[PDB]
Amino acid sequence: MLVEMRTYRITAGKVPEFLKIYQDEGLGIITQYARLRGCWTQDSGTLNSVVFWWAYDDYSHRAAQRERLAADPQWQAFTPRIVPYLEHQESVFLVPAAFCPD
Amino acid sequence: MLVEMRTYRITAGKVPEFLKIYQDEGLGIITQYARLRGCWTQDSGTLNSVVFWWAYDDYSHRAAQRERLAADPQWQAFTPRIVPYLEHQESVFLVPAAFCPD
């Protein structure tokens, strides 16, 4: 397995707005293609930050599912709604330790 | 709920050693006191980095369980074994979004 951890720094004060738009409009689309294991806001360090945990079987399943997501007309119609909130985006790849629970 | 995400930068090359010592000697102790939801190594960005996801009901349950862990003689006898591997430690607090799966 493989987790992609993606962190979005949002326009100050606008995190609740971003999360409503994401929840009402994006969640149903993207979860057709990737397994969400967690969505969080930061309570320490850099505030106004939303952390997503995406789970894939491996890099090639990830690459294939991300293409099918990119090609989705619904998804392409959705991202312009969140883009104005996105100040900064980052991504880290994680591979489980031997004792990682699944 | 509340997640504490703790990231340990390990002496270069020594991550497998650290993970064996942690697994064989520390895991059983600390999991008596906190819920581990995931343990990962970084495959991108800063390598030689171990990411732990700790789950607590809230800040006060966390504070109470961390005291009981600190007071554990087994735990106090264990940490000196990993300390020489720890180059750098960091911690971020996470609170779930409305649609965060549990």
Side-chain angles (χ1 to χ4, degrees), chain A residues 8-13 15-16 18-19 21-22 48 79-89:
Chain A
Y8 295 171
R9 194 203 302 147
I10 301 302
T11 308
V15 166
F18 169 82
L19 285 182
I21 299 184
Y22 199 95
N48 299 275
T79 53
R81 277 189 62 62
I82 48 159
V83 146
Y85 299 88
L86 296 189
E87 242 176 38
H88 178 106
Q89 288 179 274

Side-chain angles (χ1 to χ4, degrees), chain B residues 11-13 15-16 18-19 21-34 36-64:
Chain B
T11 308
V15 166
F18 169 82
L19 285 182
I21 299 184
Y22 199 95
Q23 178 163 358
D24 297 15
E25 303 184 28
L27 191 54
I29 297 161
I30 178 170
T31 56
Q32 299 175 12
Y33 308 106
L36 185 74
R37 304 256 287 269
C39 189
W40 321 84
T41 65
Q42 280 192 21
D43 198 31
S44 81
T46 294
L47 307 173
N48 299 275
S49 294
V50 180
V51 184
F52 293 82
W53 294 337
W54 297 105
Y56 303 105
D57 296 315
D58 52 32
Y59 278 108
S60 80
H61 276 86
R62 176 190 177 264

